[PDB]
């Protein structure tokens, strides 16, 4: 069946003999009398593309299915990842790239576009070297992917952290372009000049108990030029053993900690880093989006092809001495498995055995008892043919 | 195991198991109980460690005649044998202890 939710279709395949027939009404064959019996006459059905592999022992068999089952459903939850993190990426606020022409291509056919998609598909190989080549191969891609998911996240965690220093209230800043540098005097080598705020309620309360300093606390010049959000921020005087005291007596009415000693350079690493950190994640962005998506498109095509061999693997199983046979696609609108599937699937499995007839069927594992497994990889009760979920 | 091997081996196995004639006591709560007996032919080889790791879960007695079916003989006599020589022991013990 399928798995997504999107404005496109859902996929199966299903394993057919040839000495199967598609039994609804007497006097034909399979490939005949089946093309619009799934209801409708809108689908389109069609076969599997994908001779023999060589093989030496049934025990074999069966350990290179286990053991590709299990990287192909990892291999799933890798994709399901990737999705994931490209929403995150958030190329569009809905899901983007996506149903779109696969590979530039329209997307309907672009799976039963399979007429040997070959990149290193080639006979040559044999059982065990694709395994190990597959896997290896979704390995390396996905741990690419991994490490791009990476950059993003301590990229994204070190931008959000500049970026609360440029947002919320005053005394969470931090001071490179709201103030400017010249009201510090350093004309004289005594006086020490810090820049503290206090709140509007006294802003100029602090103009009566200001005068017990020591020498040359210049009058008649201090003031407030700027106001964070609405408090104030003003001019003191005091000299180099007058910094301390001040603060304590200061504090001694609950002024916040907050004071920015100032040098030019301060401000000018601010914004270089600012603006480094800011062109960083765009870059990152912009060109992760399209590496991303690259390595998906690229990657769909094996991904499905090992669930092909899968199938394969059950057919060279269940009916054995010809390899393959018409090992069916099929193609209709979603939505309707529902009375799509029953009647024709409980028929080719009613051919499929000649000993047992109950109501309950499926695939299920639940840990209960030697009942309810249902596969040939793992126990089963009543399960003739082989189909998955296939969607992109 | 009847329907399971049926798949999962294909059915690959020519499945025989009969019904037990007057079945006898169970040992792990020790009750009575019922049993069939299924017989397995192979020529694939590791499907038998398949065999073992599934059917240990229940009970693996593990057993097999001599397919040359003459070793039939001594399978019988040595250890008929024996439970010709275990039936004394039972009556020596408990007449001992119970006098």
Excluded at chain 1, 212 to 231: F, M
Excluded at chain 1, 242 to 256: D, G, H, L, Y
Aim: hydrophobic share 40%.
């Amino acid at each position: 069946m399928a798995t997504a939710l999107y404005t496109a279709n859902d996929f199966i395949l299903i394993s057919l003999p040839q000495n199967a027939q598609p039994v609804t009404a007497p006097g034909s064959k399979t490939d005949s009398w089946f093309n619009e019996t799934l209801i409708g006459g809108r689908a389109f059905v069609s076969d599997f593309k994908i001779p023999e592999f060589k093989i030496g022992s049934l025990d074999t068999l069966i350990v290179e299915s286990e053991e590709l089952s299990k990287v192909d459903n990892q291999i799933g939850a890798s994709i399901g990842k990737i999705i994931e993190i490209l929403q995150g990426l958030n190329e569009t606020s809905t899901n983007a790239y996506r149903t779109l022409p696969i590979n530039n291509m329209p997307v309907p056919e672009y799976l039963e576009n399979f007429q040997w998609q070959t990149r290193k598909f080639k006979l040559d190989k044999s059982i065990k070297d694709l395994i190990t080549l597959i896997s290896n191969e979704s390995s390396q891609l996905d741990a690419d992917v991994r490490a791009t998911y990476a950059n993003y996240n301590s990229a994204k965690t070190n931008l959000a952290a500049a970026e609360r220093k440029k947002t919320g209230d005053l005394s969470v800043r931090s001071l490179h372009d709201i103030v400017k540098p010249e009201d510090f005097v350093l004309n004289s080598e005594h006086l020490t000049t810090v820049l503290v705020a206090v709140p509007k309620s006294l802003k100029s309360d602090f103009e009566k108990s200001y005068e017990t300093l020591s020498k040359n606390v210049v009058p008649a010049s201090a003031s407030v030029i700027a106001e964070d959000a609405e408090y104030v921020l003003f001019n003191v005087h005091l000299f180099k053993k007058n910094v301390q005291e001040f603060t304590t007596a200061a504090r001694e009415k609950k002024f916040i900690p907050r004071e920015f000693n100032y040098s030019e350079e301060l401000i000018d690493q601010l914004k270089k880093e600012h603006d480094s950190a800011a062109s960083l994640e765009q870059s990152l962005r912009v060109q992760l989006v399209r590496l991303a998506k690259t390595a998906y498109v690229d990657v769909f095509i094996n991904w499905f092809h090992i669930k092909a061999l899968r199938v394969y693997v059950e057919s060279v199983l269940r009916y054995g001495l010809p390899p393959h046979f018409n090992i069916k696609i099929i193609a209709v609108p979603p939505k309707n498995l529902s009375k799509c599937k029953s009647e024709l699937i409980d028929a080719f499995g009613f051919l499929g055995g000649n000993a047992f007839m109950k109501d309950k069927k499926g695939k299920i594992n639940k840990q209960d008892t030697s009942l309810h497994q249902y596969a040939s990889l793992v126990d089963t009760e009543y399960e003739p043919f082989v189909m998955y979920i296939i969607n992109l | 195991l009847e329907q399971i091997l049926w798949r999962v081996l294909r059915g690959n196995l020519f499945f025989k198991t009969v019904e037990i004639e007057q079945p006898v006591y169970d040992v792990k709560t020790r009750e009575y109980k019922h049993k069939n007996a299924f017989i397995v032919f192979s020529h694939g080889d590791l499907i038998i460690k398949r065999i073992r790791k599934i059917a240990e879960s229940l009970d693996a007695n593990l057993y097999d005649v001599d397919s040359s079916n003459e070793g039939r003989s001594q399978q019988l006599a040595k250890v008929n044998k024996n439970l010709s020589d275990l039936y004394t022991v039972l009556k020596t013990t408990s007449t001992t202890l119970e006098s």
